[PDB]
Amino acid sequence: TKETVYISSIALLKMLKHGRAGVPMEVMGLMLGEFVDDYTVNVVDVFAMPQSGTGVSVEAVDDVFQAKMMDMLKQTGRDQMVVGWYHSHPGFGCWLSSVDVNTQKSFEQLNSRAVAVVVDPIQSVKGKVVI
């Protein structure tokens, strides 16, 4: 089956600039948006996770820093919950490793609607973003 995932135009340039800046380390960031039933995933705004040298591990997610930043976003006009996160994979295609899947399993108990996005800011410079 195929599913249409809508992403705002403002989220594309933010996820592209974040992953393209640092070439290595495979950075990561959260997202915000809504849903329509189970067949539609909407992304409005994205969040930027802090940098860590572990390469997206179970220890690279800080619940203290995550809880404090979401309280400030609600006063700036963001009413949307977290729809998932995006992970950069420079030089490769779109695929999930054993670490990325195991890290993705940790957020299933928190929010079951989370979406793991694989973005490639390197090979997306041809005019068609590969994501």
Binding site: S9, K17, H18, R20, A48, P50, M69, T76
Partner: protein, 157 residues
């Protein structure tokens, strides 16, 4: 003189904060920009949005929360250590009388000349509506510099 160069990430962000915030009743949306103003060409690689409320009939009443200034600094330094606060932008082309009072709020945080950025959300002009002013000693005058678009594979793509 100097030059002003802004990536489309900052231009699109300032223009998208009007619809998301649902600002109405002829109000303004104030936000902060990040970059490096030390060189001759100012490059703005980042932007944010802060809550701002000011009375229309009274220009002597203004409020700005300083927690967002300290929260974004601790957030950026943990991600991009090369970005610092170079100034702030407004939501409209028409200049108000509060530009001198807002300049006194960021003079302590900014380590250089505060950059006044002017962006038109209505886009009722021709070409590039975005304007860039520099506040220098006159009391104080605003010197305007030409605004361009950054050429890089991280934005224009």
């Amino acid at each position: 003189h100097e030059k002003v160069t802004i990536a489309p990430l900052v231009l699109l962000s300032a223009l998208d904060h009007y619809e998301r915030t649902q600002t109405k009743e002829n109000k303004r949306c104030v936000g902060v920009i990040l970059g490096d103003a030390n060189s001759s060409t100012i490059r703005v690689t980042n932007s944010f949005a802060l809550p701002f409320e000011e009375d229309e009939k009274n220009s002597d009443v203004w409020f700005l929360d300083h927690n967002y200034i300290e929260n974004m600094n601790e957030m950026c330094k943990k991600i991009n250590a090369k970005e610092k606060l170079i100034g702030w932008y407004h939501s409209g082309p028409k200049l108000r009388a509060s530009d001198l009072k807002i300049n006194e709020l960021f003079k302590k945080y900014t380590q250089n000349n505060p950059l006044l950025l002017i962006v038109d959300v209505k886009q009722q002009g021709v070409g590039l509506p975005t304007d860039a002013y520099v506040a220098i000693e006159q009391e104080k005058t605003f010197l305007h510099l030409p605004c361009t678009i950054e050429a890089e594979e991280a934005e224009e793509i």
